[PDB]
Design a protein around this nucleic acid. Structure first.
Lengths: 112, 239, 202, 67, 61, 24, 53, 148
RNA sequence: CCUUCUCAAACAUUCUGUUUGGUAGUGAGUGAUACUCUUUGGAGUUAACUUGAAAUUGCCUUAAA
């Protein structure tokens, strides 16, 4: 048997934690929901994680959304074994002298 | 002016030091104070060059692995109007394909198709009116290169489309200009071209013309002539 | 409900929010008159393209009820609540920056104005929420006669003219189902169908 | 009066259609025998008021046209 | 009674098409039937027994 | 004909075995 | 038997665009709407020339 | 409880993917009789160089002719054909030829998108939009063939 | 489950040339050393190549019933 942690991938553009929380709450309230986002840029990587309050609800949601197609993107949902907690996901004159010295060093080096 | 002897020595040093790009691709690098810190616009600057560097590319691209093609993005009205042949063939240049804004989002919307289609062209020309809408169509990868990045061209006369306007603008871009990007960083580099471009006698003049604009148009900190990952040759120094 | 609806709502809201943000930034920069980082320093209005003259011209306001996929933002919500246009001032320099924001959500002569005023006929009156009809001219005299309005015709004239009742009155004042009604709605959809720097669309 | 009016209208609609059809022919017979759109002897009535050009205030020339 | 059946033949995809009679030219050329119909309509217009739709719009008055 | 043989094999796999054939 | 007016115009267009170059005429994508063979094209052109010039 | 070759129907594409397939197919609706007639009359009047038209293939004999040539990319099959023998073998033929197939409930619904009262099958050969067709084919495969 | 910021001014008289501003991006992956700075607290840039829009956890209700 699998735990309540749920993993999703291939999220369409514009999909964020807001929808992952609102829509999946219809099946049942979920303990947590987080989205994978780059640290340099706040845009999402089209995948994330979320955990339901109960394992049965998690697997029911996975079965009911196993291979749904959304505006050209097929969203896969995977049930994970015990553990695998949803963690770490977050909503992300001296200069002139030095330049002269570096220029001299470059002049010396280019002969290499 | 800056000593042309330095450029003459630099070109010979590049010849001695000389991946065909890493072999013969000549480029000039400039250091400055990382302008546009608070903005990330992809606006480009068409440097004035009195040498038709695109002509050797058309002549030399025949045997190249990636053929050279001319791209001309135009607004809906312009496409609906022998236009490319009657005014450009006499000069030895011609626009190979014309793509409309609607076309990009319907037939080239797919990223897999877009990356393979836009990558086939190097002279990316786009109308001034539609220049602002380009980044929302071809995404980021198109702007990753000074080649594939669209170049704004003025095709409008008295706000109306004019064949002569387009002809002279494209002629000037092809034979009288050289685009260069302005990234948000200290490093500014112009991809001058492969060594076969504008045999070293004219390479010195091209480098001098580029350096004139670099020094006058910006508070450049240092200028070097470089080859891909090769040691930087000091071209000019200023404070 | 399927996730497609909420996904589309979020995408449309984000797009329109970015569009409104660019418009607000452009207006703020224009207010400073620093025409050195903006596409157009002047203002335009589209009927064809027409220059936005500084004259506070007054024109009727219509509701378009959309784009539906775009959930109304907080700023647009407040603007519509103040103008009570949520249900399906003048063109001054201080009103244009707020009218442009609600531009996608919204869009005469004496013949049209007179008929509209004499047909709609909203009159706030005391239950408290009564707004039934322009019952009698004496009602206007009692509630608004102190301002020099002896009848609703005075309000109409002052709205058409550059009077004071134009401002004062703000505190006083295919659509079917079935198979037969679907074709007309589908046809009207063609007429039913936005850049930040573009002129306002009338 | 020119004021808003505060039943099965289908009967009213049919009656209106019939009366309009009749009035079309009536008006055709009577007639047999444009910026204003944007603004809008035989008896004592005809004998009297003749040439008496009236001026009507806000309540022949009309002051409403001044708007 | 209704025992499962094994896809002993469909389990291997057909590598090559079975048919023959290589593609006719008409598949790479505009249909000749369309040209015949267009010429018939042209003949009818010449005989004056067909009114073009543009003229029908005027006659709709 | 190859096409006829292919069709016959397809029909054979679809129809299975006849009740008298099943005795084998 | 002769050639139709539209057929005559089509033949004249190809003759002007390619002259007697039958091989080049065959590959004309926007004038040879119907992919006629070289033999048919040359026979039709010869008939047109004999009838007209 | 019926032979395995039967009851392959009654398992069909889900509502969402079926609606997506119908929306995709509606784009390539063949020119109806009135539209074709008026277009031909307009062309004749203009006469008095052309792109290949795109439309869905629905004729059972024509579709079967396209099938086994490997030209057909996606085929829709009605599950309520009274002569069931006309469609019992079609899924097996498509599987042997490697052509994805989808069973859609209602021959009338299948025919409503091709200007016909009823249509047993519908298949697509050419496309305008190839990425959308590929995505739809992948979704149909993953939701129908890998499940049933 | 809709769909994408389609020119503002000046001079120009060439069947219209030049300047300013206007280009705010799906992600992931590979990549052989150059310009810098806070110099430890890691941050801004610089050729080239792959891609199914690919992917495991970086501390306003008549688009209505």
């Amino acid at each position: 048997e699998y735990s309540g942690i749920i993993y999703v991938s291939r999220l369409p553009h514009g999909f964020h934690e807001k929808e992952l929380s609102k829509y999946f709450a219809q099946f049942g309230d979920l303990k947590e929901v987080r989205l994978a986002r780059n640290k340099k840029t706040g845009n999402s990587r089209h995948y994330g994680f979320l955990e339901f309050v109960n394992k049965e609800d998690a697997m029911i949601a996975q079965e009911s959304m196993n291979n749904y197609l959304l505006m050209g993107h097929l969203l896969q949902v995977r049930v994970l074994p015990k553990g695998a907690k949803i963690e770490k996901l977050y909503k992300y004159k001296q200069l002139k002298d030095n330049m002269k010295q570096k220029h001299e060093e470059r002049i010396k080096k280019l002969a290499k | 002016a800056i000593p042309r002897e330095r450029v003459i020595k630099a070109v010979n040093e590049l010849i001695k030091f000389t991946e065909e790009l890493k072999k013969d691709l000549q480029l000039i690098v400039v250091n400055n104070k990382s302008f546009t810190g608070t903005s990330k616009s992809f606006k480009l600057k068409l440097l004035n060059v009195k040498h038709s560097f695109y002509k050797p590319w058309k002549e030399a691209s025949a045997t190249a692995v990636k053929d050279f093609k001319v791209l001309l993005i135009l607004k809906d009205s312009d496409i609906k109007k022998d236009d490319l042949f009657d005014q450009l063939d006499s000069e030895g240049i011609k626009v190979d394909e014309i793509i409309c804004g609607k076309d990009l989002k319907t037939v080239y919307k797919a990223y897999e198709a877009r990356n393979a289609f836009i990558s086939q062209f190097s002279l990316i020309l786009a109308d001034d009116s539609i220049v602002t809408s380009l980044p929302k169509l071809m995404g980021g990868k198109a702007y990753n290169k000074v080649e594939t990045t669209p170049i704004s061209i003025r095709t409008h006369a008295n706000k109306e489309f004019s064949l002569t306007t387009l002809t002279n603008n494209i002629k000037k871009v092809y034979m009288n200009q050289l685009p260069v990007k302005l990234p948000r960083g200290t490093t500014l580099n112009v991809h001058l071209g492969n060594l076969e471009w504008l045999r070293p006698e004219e390479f010195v003049d091209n480098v001098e013309l580029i350096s004139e604009q670099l020094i006058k148009a910006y508070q450049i900190r240092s200028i070097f002539i470089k080859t891909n990952r090769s040691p930087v040759l000091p071209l000019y120094y200023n404070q | 409900v399927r996730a497609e609806s909420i996904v589309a709502k979020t995408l449309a809201t984000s797009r329109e929010k970015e569009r409104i943000k660019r418009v607000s930034i452009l207006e703020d920069k224009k207010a400073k008159n620093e025409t050195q980082h903006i596409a157009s320093g002047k203002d335009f209005i589209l009927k064809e393209k027409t220059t936005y003259d500084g004259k506070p011209a007054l024109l009727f306001i219509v509701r378009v009820r959309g784009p539906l996929a775009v959930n109304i933002p907080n700023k647009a919500f407040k603007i519509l609540s103040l103008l009570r246009l949520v249900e399906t001032v003048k063109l001054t320099k201080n009103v244009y920056p707020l009218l442009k924001v609600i531009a996608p959500y919204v869009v005469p002569s004496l013949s049209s104005i007179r008929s509209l005023i004499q047909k709609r006929g909203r009159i706030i009156y005391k239950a408290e929420p009564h707004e039934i009809v322009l019952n009698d001219n004496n009602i206007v005299e009692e509630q608004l006669g102190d301002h020099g309005i002896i009848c609703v015709e005075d309000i109409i004239h002052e709205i058409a003219t550059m009077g004071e009742s134009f401002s004062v009155c703000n505190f006083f004042l295919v659509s079917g189902f079935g198979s037969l009604n679907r074709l007309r709605k589908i046809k009207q959809r063609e007429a039913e169908s936005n850049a930040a720097t573009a002129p306002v669309i009338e | 009066f020119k004021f808003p009016e505060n039943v099965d209208f289908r009967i009213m609609l049919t009656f209106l259609e019939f009366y309009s059809t009749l009035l079309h022919f009536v008006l055709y017979k009577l007639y047999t025998d444009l910026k204003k759109d944007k603004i809008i002897y035989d008896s004592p009535v005809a004998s009297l008021f003749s040439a008496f050009v009236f001026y009507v205030s806000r309540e022949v020339i009309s002051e409403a046209a001044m708007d | 009674p209704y025992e499962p059946l094994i896809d002993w033949f469909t389990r291997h995809e057909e590598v090559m098409p079975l048919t023959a009679v290589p593609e006719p030219k008409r598949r790479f050329v505009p249909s000749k039937n369309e040209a015949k119909r267009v010429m018939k309509i042209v003949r009818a217009i010449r005989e004056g027994r067909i009114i073009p739709p543009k003229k029908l719009k005027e006659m709709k008055e | 004909s190859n096409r006829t043989k292919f069709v016959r094999s397809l029909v054979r796999e679809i129809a299975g075995l006849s009740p008298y054939e099943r005795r084998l | 038997r002769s050639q139709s007016e539209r057929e005559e115009e089509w033949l004249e267009k190809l003759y002007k665009k390619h002259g007697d170059d039958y091989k080049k005429m065959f590959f004309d994508k926007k004038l040879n709407i119907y992919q006629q063979s070289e033999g048919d094209l040359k026979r039709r052109l010869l008939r047109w020339k004999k009838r007209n010039g | 409880k019926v032979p395995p070759t039967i009851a392959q129907f009654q398992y069909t594409l889900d509502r969402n993917t079926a609606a997506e397939t119908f929306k995709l197919f509606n784009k390539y609706r063949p020119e109806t009789a009135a539209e074709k007639k008026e277009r031909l009359t307009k062309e004749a009047a203009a006469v008095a160089a052309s792109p290949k038209p795109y439309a869905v293939k629905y004729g059972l004999n024509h579709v079967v002719a396209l099938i086994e040539n490997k030209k057909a990319k996606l085929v829709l099959i009605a599950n309520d054909v009274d002569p069931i023998e006309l469609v019992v073998f079609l899924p097996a033929l498509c599987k042997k030829m490697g052509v994805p197939y989808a069973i859609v409930k209602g021959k009338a619904r299948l025919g409503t998108l091709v200007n016909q009262k009823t249509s047993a099958v519908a298949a697509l050969t050419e496309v305008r939009d190839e990425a959308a067709l590929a995505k739809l084919v992948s979704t149909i495969d993953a939701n129908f063939a890998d499940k049933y």
